[PDB]
């Protein structure tokens with residue numbers, strides 16, 4: 048999100064016709080070194096459209112549900128909601144290995160929320176039905 | 186122009202752009 | 210080491226070099242492979258036995274100037290050994306083969322063999338860190354700022370038209386010819402014998418080229434000015450000897466438009482470029498009429514492009530606005546274009562690492578050259 | 580959703596796009612599917628490598644232009660996806676599928692498979708909540724205000740009269756046919772070869788289409804005007820290259836009425852309309868005689884409907900008053916009529932709730948698209 052926001056801000060800075068006008072004077076001076084390198088050699092536009100490609104996947108993701116729920120039903124349906132949000136794949140073109148290890152890190156974040164919700168009963172000594180019901184729902 | 190002076194094999198008095206007499 | 214890369218403004222007749230980012234190459238010199246033809250009698254005589262630079266530019270009365278780049282195409286790799294051997298002089302470099310990346314250039318429609326053997330040289334004998342070699346037309350377009358444009362580039366035994374739209378892979382449409390000023394100057398030596406000037410040395414040929422760039426122009430009327438009485442411009446040697454010219458100064462470049470005058474079937478620069486136009490598309494053709502990149506020092510003549518404008522006007526149909534772009538530095542446009550391209554960060558993939566060629570071969574780079 | 584409902588102008592040849600309430604389809608463009616025919620070895624060229632919009636509508640021969648709607652029946656799907664991504668482009672939409680109600684139009688008797696693909700797109704890739712897929716002639720009835728009428732569409736490879744009466748489901752009576760000016764223009768490329776014009780590109784075909792849409796018409800007298808000889812007026816290429824038009828301008832569209840010129844047995848869809856008339860009833864036939872609609876871009880020709888008038892006059896019996904209605908905005912009639920229907924409250928029941936519809940499979944709206 049910070050990347051997209053910075054893309055917007057600095058792209059307005061980029062598209063500031065004053066600096067572009069300085070570049071007009073520079074190209075009029077034919078010093079195409081800096082001008083052409085600033086245009087071509089800067090892969091900023093590529094980064095812009097790349098984050099614009101990931102833009103819907105980087106938008107309204109239901110991850111806070113795992114951060115704000117201690118119910119296996121809520122968490123499980125939150126998993127489903129998250130999963131559905133993760134269908135923006137081919138329409139975003141994210142790196143396979145980065146996607147794998149990304150969702151892998153997400154699974155670790157999930158396990159962290161699982162330990163968070165887990166640390167509340169200790170049904171090994173307290174009631175066995177807690178063990179039964181909670182274990183099954185888990 | 187300064188680079189045009191810096192190197193020897195550079196001639197002048199000829200416009201770098203040659204176009205047709207585009208009759209309007 | 211990947212420091213400021215050495216931008217080498219090559220060339221059939223004038224092969225020089227400089228760096229990236231800079232706007233003036235510090236090593237400006239042509240193509241010339243000379244060596245003394247006499248016996249050192251008195252000791253203390255200046256030597257080196259392979260004279261290039263001020264030696265050659267000083268001791269012209271003793272050297273046998275050789276040329277591997279026949280029509281730009283190298284024919285003598287040993288002469289290339291000596292060429293770079295002189296290039297590799299620190300007074301000519303102030304570096305090593307590895308102290309800077311190298312940026313060498315090419316001409317379109319050339320065999321692999323050239324790149325192969327050269328890669329062997331600069332990555333085995335010499336040991337260049339990073340280097341890529343390609344057409345000078347692209348670099349010229351860099352200097353023009355244009356991307357879509359027919360690069361009319363001419364060497365000195367080379368004359369060619371390179372149609373380009375944003376640097377696309379169009380080798381069928383892209384043309385190339387290898388015939389120019391070397392041969393024209395040789396034909397001027399033929400003029401000399403017809404005039405009575407008994408000359409047959411390469412050093413004399415240098416002077417003919419000095420006239421070519423100096424006391425030789427163009428006209429626009431072939432037959433008309435041929436019928437028109439000349440003035441016989443008396444050239445003067447370094448000695449100062451009277452050398453009349455006549456209309457031969459512009460008569461010899463008629464062969465560039467009339468290739469059969471030397472007995473060589475072709476169609477002239479104009480028609481060959483028109484053939485390149487034919488391979489393009491009507492809409493893109495109009496752009497290329499407006500996008501004409503004349504380049505090469507050989508193209509420096511009085512109304513050169515203006516005559517050619519009239520030629521293509523007689524060739525191209527009506528309501529066709531032809532526009533030429535031809536800077537005064539139709540040499541360094543390639544050098545500055547390489548100075549910019551070599552100054553890029555994406556250029557990593559564009560260059561070729563030393564070890565890469567040292568791993569498998571130049572065919573990988575031949576994949577990279579297209 | 581409480582936003583402006585998108586009206587997909589899924590034109591066969593020219594697939595435009597727009598919304599409801601508006602009277603102008605947002606963006607108009609054909610089935611062109613371009614990809615460059617070269618390689619941008621030079622850095623500084625243009626990106627994309629797939630071109631929809633002025634990128635392709637400005638450079639054609641450079642790009643491998645494609646067209647998958649095999650007589651409307653699209654075969655590409657990935658390209659369609661990208662086209663719809665381009666539908667949400669910056670100039671184009673900058674919106675979401677979820678953010679807008681979308682309405683699709685279709686030709687009758689299309690394969691369910693295409694609708695399945697569309698469901699996959701707008702329910703997996705895109706996520707339109709209010710997505711409905713409809714017919715195309717009903718739209719024309721909305722624009723004309725009529726309810727009863729013979730709607731003749733005119734695509735690039737799809738033309739068929741749609742005899743409607745107050746939206747009554749008459750699939751047996753109503754006739755669908757997929758053929759139009761595509762192969763007529765290609766047949767004109769056959770004429771080009773028979774007249775010495777070496778053209779094989781779709782871009783060249785588009786130039787011929789510019790002639791088709793521009794310098795072509797329907798001569799009401801078939802052989803009375805065909806057996807004669809025209810002066811073959813001259814057409815000018817993008818370069819301005821003079822090319823004669825010829826009798827072809829009216830000779831080639833006769834194939835629309837004389838399908839055996841290509842060899843395919845058919846009637847000349849006006850006779851298929853007569854078959855629809857036969858399927859209808861005597862006095863109701865008279866209503867449809869008085870009610871004929873001409874939509875689609877390919878309707879635009881001189882004496883087009885007038886020649887067809889003469890045809891039916893040679894077909895329909897005596898005291899048969901027939902009336903046609905050809906709105907100036909043929910393709911837009913469908914678009915504006917889609918805007919009309921998309922601007923309806925009853926129309927909310929036409930589609931099915933997105934997620935449940937996905938769970939409902941496709942047969943539900945397949946049964947509800949009638």
Ligand SMILES: Nc1ncnc2c1ncn2[C@@H]1O[C@H](COP(=O)(O)OP(=O)(O)O)[C@@H](O)[C@H]1O
Nearest residue numbers: 220221222223363364365421422505506507509
């Ligand atoms: N005024 C001139 N008239 C004719 N020829 C020239 C002139 N100036 C330079 N040349 C020739 O043009 C050639 C330079 O153009 P360039 O593209 O650098 O070609 P090259 O490949 O020969 O170096 C030189 O070799 C030189 O002999």
Ligand SMILES: Nc1ncnc2c1ncn2[C@@H]1O[C@H](COP(=O)(O)OP(=O)(O)O)[C@@H](O)[C@H]1O
Nearest residue numbers: 590591592593733734735760792875876877879
């Ligand atoms: N002035 C014109 N004359 C003839 N045909 C035209 C004209 N303008 C557009 N067209 C035709 O419209 C067709 C485009 O197909 P289109 O009408 O978009 O399909 P659909 O009828 O399904 O919308 C092409 O045949 C094109 O030739």
